[PDB]
Amino acid sequence: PVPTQGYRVVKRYPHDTTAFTEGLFYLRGHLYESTGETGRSSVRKVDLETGRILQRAEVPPPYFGAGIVAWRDRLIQLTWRNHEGFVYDLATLTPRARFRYPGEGWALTSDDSHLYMSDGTAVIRKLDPDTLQQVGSIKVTAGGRPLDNLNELEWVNGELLANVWLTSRIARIDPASGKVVAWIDLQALVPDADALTDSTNDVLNGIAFDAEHDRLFVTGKRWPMLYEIRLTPLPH
Numbered sequence: 426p427v428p429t430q431g432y433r434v435v436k437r438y439p440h441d442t443t444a445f446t447e448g449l450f451y452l453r454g455h456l457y458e459s460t461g462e463t464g465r466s467s468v469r470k471v472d473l474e475t476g477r478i479l480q481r482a483e484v485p486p487p488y489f490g491a492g493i494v495a496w497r498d499r500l501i502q503l504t505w506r507n508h509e510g511f512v513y514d515l516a517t518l519t520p521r522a523r524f525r526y527p528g529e530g531w532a533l534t535s536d537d538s539h540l541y542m543s544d545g546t547a548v549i550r551k552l553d554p555d556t557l558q559q560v561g562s563i564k565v566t567a568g569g570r571p572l573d574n575l576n577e578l579e580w581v582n583g584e585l586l587a588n589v590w591l592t593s594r595i596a597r598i599d600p601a602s603g604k605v606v607a608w609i610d611l612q613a614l615v616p617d618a619d620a621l622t623d624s625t626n627d628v629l630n631g632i633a634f635d636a637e638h639d640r641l642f643v644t645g646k647r648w649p650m651l652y653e654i655r656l657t658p659l660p661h
């Protein structure tokens with residue numbers, strides 16, 4: 426069976442409890458965070474240490490923003506059920522382009538050549554960053570069972586991390602095979618794993634990796650904190 430990998434909390438940082446997190450990434454010392462509601466949706470540039478909003482953009486109405494990723498000088502964002510995505514200039518957070526895709530947009534991340542998109546199914550789409558056209562896919566499995574409902578992604582050291590909200594776990598995925606190589610069980614950080622929870626409640630929904638300093642951050646909808654966590658090496 427798939428092993429469970431340990432972790433430790435390095436540091437807790439403040440997080441704004443108005444942030445209904447829909448995606449997160451880190452770039453050049455700041456966090457960028459999507460916040461989801463069809464009735465007010467935003468992309469925020471956030472100071473890590475203080476949790477304060479430095480800059481924000483409103484998602485084009487009537488859409489609800491979903492996952493986000495940086496690519497070069499751009500910020501690319503999905504929408505939940507609008508079929509529509511947006512590209513912003515990163516520096517000014519002003520919208521510059523739009524694109525359309527089949528299905529629901531849940532989460533995005535990127536490696537050095539491609540974007541990776543979750544749509545709630547077990548098949549992650551690999552996209553060309555400039556055209557947004559689909560050029561490949563990864564079928565994700567854990568011990569052979571399809572794994573769907575992946576509400577956040579983050580690329581970390583050649584692997585894809587994906588949150589599985591209904592089990593409170595992050596899957597570390599080998600992108601070459603699509604196989605889950607380990608679970609990380611973050612139930613300890615979820616504000617209340619004990620109650621009846623839907624995907625709109627205080628679920629983990631932001632995973633961001635600072636590759637320059639090898640820092641992994643996690644937060645979620647209305648969480649009071651953002652955590653830097655260090656994964657414990659697995660044996661074998």
Ligand SMILES: [Ca+2]
Binds near residue numbers: 450534577578
């Ligand atoms: Ca992310």
